Amino acid sequence: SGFRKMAFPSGKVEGCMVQVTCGTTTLNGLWLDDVVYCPRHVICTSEDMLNPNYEDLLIRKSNHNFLVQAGNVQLRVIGHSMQNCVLKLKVDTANPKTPKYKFVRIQPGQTFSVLACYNGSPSGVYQCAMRPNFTIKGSFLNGSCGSVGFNIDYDCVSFCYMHHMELPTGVHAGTDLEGNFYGPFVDRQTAQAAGTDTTITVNVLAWLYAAVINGDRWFLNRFTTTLNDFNLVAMKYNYEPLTQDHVDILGPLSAQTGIAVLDMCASLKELLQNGMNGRTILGSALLEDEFTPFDVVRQCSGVTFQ
Amino acid sequence: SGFRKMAFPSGKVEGCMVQVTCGTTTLNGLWLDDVVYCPRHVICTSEDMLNPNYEDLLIRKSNHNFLVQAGNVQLRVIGHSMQNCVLKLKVDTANPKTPKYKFVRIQPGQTFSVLACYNGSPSGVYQCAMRPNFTIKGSFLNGSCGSVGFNIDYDCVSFCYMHHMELPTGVHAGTDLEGNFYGPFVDRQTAQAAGTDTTITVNVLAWLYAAVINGDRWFLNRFTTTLNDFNLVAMKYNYEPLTQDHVDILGPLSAQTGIAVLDMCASLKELLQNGMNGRTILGSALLEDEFTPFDVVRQCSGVTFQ
Ligand SMILES: NC(=O)c1cc(N2CC2)c([N+](=O)[O-])cc1[N+](=O)[O-]
Numbered sequence: 001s002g003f004r005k006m007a008f009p010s011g012k013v014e015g016c017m018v019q020v021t022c023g024t025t026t027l028n029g030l031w032l033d034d035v036v037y038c039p040r041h042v043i044c045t046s047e048d049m050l051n052p053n054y055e056d057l058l059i060r061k062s063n064h065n066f067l068v069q070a071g072n073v074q075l076r077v078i079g080h081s082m083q084n085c086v087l088k089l090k091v092d093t094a095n096p097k098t099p100k101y102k103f104v105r106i107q108p109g110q111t112f113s114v115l116a117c118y119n120g121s122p123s124g125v126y127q128c129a130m131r132p133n134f135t136i137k138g139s140f141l142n143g144s145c146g147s148v149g150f151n152i153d154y155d156c157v158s159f160c161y162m163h164h165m166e167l168p169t170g171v172h173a174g175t176d177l178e179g180n181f182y183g184p185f186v187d188r189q190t191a192q193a194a195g196t197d198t199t200i201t202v203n204v205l206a207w208l209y210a211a212v213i214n215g216d217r218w219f220l221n222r223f224t225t226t227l228n229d230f231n232l233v234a235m236k237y238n239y240e241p242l243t244q245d246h247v248d249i250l251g252p253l254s255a256q257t258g259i260a261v262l263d264m265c266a267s268l269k270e271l272l273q274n275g276m277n278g279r280t281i282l283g284s285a286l287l288e289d290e291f292t293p294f295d296v297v298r299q300c301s302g303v304t305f306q
Numbered sequence: 307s308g309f310r311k312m313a314f315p316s317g318k319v320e321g322c323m324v325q326v327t328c329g330t331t332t333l334n335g336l337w338l339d340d341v342v343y344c345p346r347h348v349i350c351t352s353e354d355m356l357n358p359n360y361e362d363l364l365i366r367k368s369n370h371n372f373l374v375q376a377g378n379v380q381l382r383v384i385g386h387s388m389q390n391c392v393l394k395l396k397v398d399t400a401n402p403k404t405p406k407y408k409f410v411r412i413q414p415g416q417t418f419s420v421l422a423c424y425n426g427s428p429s430g431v432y433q434c435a436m437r438p439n440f441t442i443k444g445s446f447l448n449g450s451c452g453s454v455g456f457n458i459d460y461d462c463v464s465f466c467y468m469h470h471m472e473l474p475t476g477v478h479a480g481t482d483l484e485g486n487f488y489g490p491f492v493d494r495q496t497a498q499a500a501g502t503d504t505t506i507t508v509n510v511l512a513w514l515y516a517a518v519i520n521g522d523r524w525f526l527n528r529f530t531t532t533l534n535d536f537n538l539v540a541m542k543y544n545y546e547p548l549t550q551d552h553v554d555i556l557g558p559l560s561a562q563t564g565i566a567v568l569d570m571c572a573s574l575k576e577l578l579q580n581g582m583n584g585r586t587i588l589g590s591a592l593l594e595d596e597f598t599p600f601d602v603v604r605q606c607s608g609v610t611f612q
């Protein structure tokens with residue numbers, strides 16, 4: 001049946017994307033009901049970014065300075081406000097395409113889909129994970145700020161990320177939909193460096209369960225281990241420590257495959273110690289950590305949204 | 307800015323997906339204007355599949371035997387016909403959500419996005435490539451037949467693939483929207499094995515150009531080569547032969563980076579000969595071949611659709 005990095009269908013989010021321009025800056029906004037959400041740096045000029053005082057810069061702006069365009073139609077802005085690092089622009093029309101939705105702040109290791117957009121227009125969709133150092137590894141060019149990340153359960157879109165910037169190392173940082181940055185990052189041009197990019201162990205294990213369900217079994221072996229023994233190994237390889245909560249989340253996959261979680265941990269431990277010796281797993285030559293256990297079950301069972 | 311395997315936004319296609327049931331079989335259909343397209347094996351029972359005579363099985367079916375449901379509403383079927391391996395069910399209502407579209411038969415090495423669906427409901431979206439042996443490497447469970455593959459230019463959706471089956475090795479086979487299978491495959495349970503899965507060289511090169519544009523440059527070197535010399539190497543590694551047409555398509559990337567195509571071919575040749583020695587390129591430990599040169603330019607320039 002196969003296993004691929006899969007994004008959620010994005011049509012429900014495409015219908016919320018709009019362009020926001022303030023003065024000479026144009027980026028993306030998210031229109032839900034009668035509010036348009038966008039990064040507050042829409043009010044900055046490029047030289048403003050080294051050390052912006054957003055509250056002062058915003059004093060010079062009025063509702064008519066924010067130009068919001070939905071596809072070809074212009075929205076009328078009747079109010080604006082700053083919430084942490086996002087601006088909320090109140091418009092006079094509710095978006096007809098607004099899906100059921102929620103805003104959520106995700107935890108590191110959780111995955112979500114990104115709908116990259118430029119000037120209010122979608123360009124593509126891909127899957128991401130909030131890394132342990134709170135950056136994400138995406139694909140964003142200038143003008144893509146304001147593109148969002150989300151997850152979908154049935155018919156409800158949970159928005160969890162809004163894109164704000166690129167670090168000098170090429171990774172990305174952004175905020176939840178309440179405007180709070182994931183991690184320590186700030187919306188200004190300063191020295192901000194990311195911390196260790198540790199591997200999300202529980203996802204690697206889930207992906208090894210997906211591999212076995214799909215026929216890639218060469219890495220299975222005769223050993224087992226314990227959580228404390230496995231974790232010694234994980235520390236050495238900059239892997240996240242595995243907890244009993246993680247073992248418990250892998251329980252459904254453990255049950256479906258008949259492979260105890262600790263036995264899979266023993267497989268992963270040999271893989272870390274000896275490498276893959278030139279072989280591949282689910283088409284990869286390295287250990288994938290951007291699938292959560294929920295993702296593997298979802299995809300191995302065909303869940304759908306409406 | 308980063309580079310990721312990215313699917314096209316799928317909302318324009320989500321609005322075309324429907325469920326089709328015939329007797330005891332349920333799968334997906336594609337509703338464009340007033341025709342619903344679906345695999346003809348919707349008329350088969352599981353035992354029919356070993357050696358189906360579709361034309362005979364279809365004699366026993368009338369318009370009212372095909373149940374088509376769009377979300378929660380039922381469509382009225384006023385005509386049905388077989389075209390190669392697809393059935394076309396004429397319905398009495400044009401789909402309101404039909405996007406501008408075209409049907410195209412793609413060539414091996416070209417990429418497209420798949421909107422996996424079950425029972426007429428989207429579950430996810432991912433990027434694929436028509437492999438040289440005409441199979442695709444997807445993620446499909448039972449009930450996913452009828453899910454389609456497509457590309458989008460601006461506002462026009464070009465549909466290029468409809469899913470029909472899984473081979474015993476786990477790869478997938480299907481048809482264009484005219485019902486002709488890609489490759490030698492047939493819609494019955496027989497011994498069908500895929501040929502060599504050769505690597506699409508021109509895409510690997512495009513992806514090396516994307517890597518350099520993104521800062522991964524460790525593989526660049528002091529050498530050059532020729533097309534005939536490079537091709538000796540490609541044959542040894544089961545890579546597609548590179549032609550002058552391929553060099554020409556990489557011309558725009560060659561121009562933007564200042565790296566002549568043959569010099570990149572020399573980099574790829576060392577990579578094939580020596581491996582990656584434990585290093586990665588654009589986050590991968592192997593050479594990616596599912597990005598076309600058009601894909602790299604599109605994504606490195608932020609093209610959008612409306
Ligand atoms: N790549 C960068 O140097 C950069 C760029 C921007 N964008 C505004 C220009 C922002 N930021 O948005 O604050 C911050 C950073 N930074 O490293 O802290």
Ligand SMILES: NC(=O)c1cc(N2CC2)c([N+](=O)[O-])cc1[N+](=O)[O-]
Nearest residue numbers: 355471472473474493494495496498
């Ligand atoms: N995995 C298979 O053995 C298989 C399954 C199906 N599906 C119908 C059950 C089809 N086919 O659709 O023709 C063909 C094959 N085949 O290998 O040729």
Ligand SMILES: [Cl-]
Nearest residue numbers: 004005310311
């Ligand atoms: Cl991917």
Ligand SMILES: [Cl-]
Nearest residue numbers: 285286590591
């Ligand atoms: Cl890899």
